[PDB]
Design a protein around this ligand. Sequence first.
Ligand SMILES: Nc1nc2c(ncn2[C@@H]2O[C@H](COP(=O)(O)OP(=O)(O)O)[C@@H](O)[C@H]2O)c(=O)[nH]1
Ligand SMILES: [Mg+2]
Length: 413
Amino acid sequence: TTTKYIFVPIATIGCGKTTVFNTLNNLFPQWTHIQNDNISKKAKLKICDLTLLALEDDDQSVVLFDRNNSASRERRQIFTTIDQKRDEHLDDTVDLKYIAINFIPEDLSEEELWDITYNRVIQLDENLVESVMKGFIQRYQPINTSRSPDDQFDHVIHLKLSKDENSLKSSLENVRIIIDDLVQNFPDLIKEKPADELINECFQKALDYKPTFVKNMTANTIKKDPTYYGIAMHYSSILENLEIVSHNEHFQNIKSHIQTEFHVTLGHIASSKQDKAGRVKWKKLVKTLGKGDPNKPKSALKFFADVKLLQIVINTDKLACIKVEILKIYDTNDVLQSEIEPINKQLHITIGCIPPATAVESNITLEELYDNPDEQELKPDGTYKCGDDTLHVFNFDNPDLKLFSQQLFVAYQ
Ligand SMILES: Nc1nc2c(ncn2[C@@H]2O[C@H](COP(=O)(O)OP(=O)(O)O)[C@@H](O)[C@H]2O)c(=O)[nH]1
Ligand SMILES: [Mg+2]
């Protein structure tokens, strides 16, 4: 009855796995070539799943299982995974021969292995390729058919690997080795050997196809986005305007947690994730105010703001903050920048927090105080119960607490 085949490389990167498998598939289009490099790291159906799917139909007899399997545990994973899922995909009467294709001769030096493969991969990335490649060689364990797991292979084909600038290419010799092996040992797979002209042509095609790299080597950069955009507030100017609450009994808790810098937050990356509104406003902030130098926790930007201090709100035993308004934002030549829209409704300067609570809670404090969209006027002095918080409101006597030319900054935390 029916026999199916899984061809399993034992290899490191650049040994010619994909070239050899692409040559064979060019000659035998009914075979299925599954490339682990082209499977998402987060794919629900991984190579063992796709291998079994590609063996279900009768006409599908061969999978070229294109993965390094450098470590002995990775060969064990093939057997145990396919053992467990096989009965969902194949009749009980089927084998399932596993043919190991050994790409690294047992007497190849580690330094010649590196010299052959590293230089093949070169010839738009420089040394990301060295650490990913050395990782596969680090954990490479040669085939050992005298013990598990490699003693579970039904057959082993031993390939050549060498510098070949003056000889037949080693992957073409290897295609010939595989074909001759199959013709002698599995005539049902290859009835008659294809013509050498055809084998050579198919190999040339495969030798010139766009290469495929493991995804950690084609791993793109994270064009990192900053954590938040702020207005740096002149320290002594904020401190001097705390005198309105300095003697208040509900502020004495807060005094020992007063911050050593004050800022108005314009936008935090976390808010790009609540609304479409929060996303769009975050993007426009990154567009207008650029990504400053990213190897510094704070970078000043060439924009400045005028800010008016409106009232102090104490969230009892939690924090104190100043509700503010931004009068204007402008650049170094004082032209107004109308396109800078803050994300937070309820703009504020956090003063200090009692350390169960954190500065992010200044927003919830002012939002719960000003929760009615049709009543946003400054509330008069006094105590306000909001949810489970007791708030105290202190309006400034001076209607003209304007702070000018406060410089914007970007923050990466
Ligand atoms: N010199 C030489 N280069 C080869 C040979 N076979 C493949 N290559 C090249 O080596 C690079 C890596 O081959 P590839 O098949 O992708 O290796 P893989 O990482 O094991 O899949 C590619 O540029 C191939 O064109 C060969 O026999 N000799
Ligand atoms: Mg490959």
